C-alpha cells in the first residue's frame, strides 16, 4: 500500500488514494478475520452458506424479472 | 512401475505369440514381476498404507487368475507356478 505523493496536489486526494489502496488490497478485512481462531468446520460451513445464498439470489431473480407486480 | 521394456520382455517370453498379450500366463507373469519389485519399496516405507492397498489388488487378482487356470487346464497350471515360483 505504498503511495508516493505526487507534485503537490492536495493531501486529501493523496489520503483518498491511500484509503483506496487499503480497500483494494484487503488490508482492513484480513486483520479482522484472523483476530480469533474459528474451527475448520465453521470455515467450511460459512463458505457453504455464502455460496448457497449467493446462488439462491440468482435463482430467485428469475421469479421476479418477468412477473408483473402492480 | 513396470517400464515398457520390462513389460515387452515378459509378453514375448510367456505368450504364445509376440502379440498374445492378455493370456492368463502373461497376465500372471506381469502381476508377479511387479509384486517382487514392490517388495523393496514396502520393506523401507512401512507406513505406506495407501500404496499397499493397491498391491493387495494385484495379489488378489493374480489369485483369481490362477484358480481359473487350474480349474480349466491343470497341465498349464503346473508349469506356470513352477516357472514363476509360488503356492507355498
Amino acid at each position: 500500500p505504498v503511495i508516493k505523493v505526487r507534485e503537490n496536489e492536495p493531501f486529501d486526494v493523496a489520503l483518498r488514494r491511500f484509503k483506496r489502496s487499503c480497500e483494494k488490497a484487503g488490508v482492513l478485512a484480513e486483520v479482522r478475520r484472523r483476530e480469533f481462531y474459528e474451527k475448520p468446520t465453521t470455515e467450511r460451513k460459512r463458505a457453504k452458506a455464502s455460496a448457497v445464498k449467493r446462488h439462491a439470489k440468482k435463482l430467485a431473480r428469475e421469479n421476479a424479472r418477468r412477473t408483473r407486480l402492480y | 512401475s513396470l517400464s515398457t521394456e520390462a513389460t515387452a520382455k515378459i509378453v514375448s517370453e510367456f505368450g504364445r505369440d509376440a502379440n498374445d498379450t492378455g493370456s492368463t500366463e502373461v497376465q500372471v507373469a506381469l502381476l508377479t514381476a511387479q509384486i517382487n519389485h514392490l517388495q523393496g519399496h514396502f520393506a523401507e516405507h512401512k507406513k505406506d498404507h495407501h500404496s499397499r492397498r493397491g498391491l493387495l489388488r494385484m495379489v488378489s487378482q493374480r489369485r483369481k487368475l490362477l484358480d481359473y487356470l487350474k480349474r480349466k487346464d491343470v497341465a498349464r497350471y503346473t508349469q506356470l507356478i513352477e516357472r514363476l515360483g509360488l503356492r507355498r
Binding site: 500500500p1 505504498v2 489502496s21 483494494k24 488490497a25 | -
Partner: protein, 65 residues
Amino acid sequence: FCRFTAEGVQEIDYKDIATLKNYITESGKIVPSRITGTRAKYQRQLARAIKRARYLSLLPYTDRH
C-alpha cells in the same frame, strides 16, 4: 474475449517474468481468476510459476522488504 493463455496452448514458465507481472497485484498477491478471465487449467500453472519465481527472487513476496 478473455483469451490470453488459451490462445497460447503451452506451459507457463517462470523465466518469462513480463507475462507473470500482468497477473499479480501491486503488492504481489496473485490475482484471482474472476478478474483476469483465464480458465482453471492455466490458473494453476500461472499460480505455480509465480511460487517458483518468488523462490528465485525474480518476483517479490510482499511490497515491503
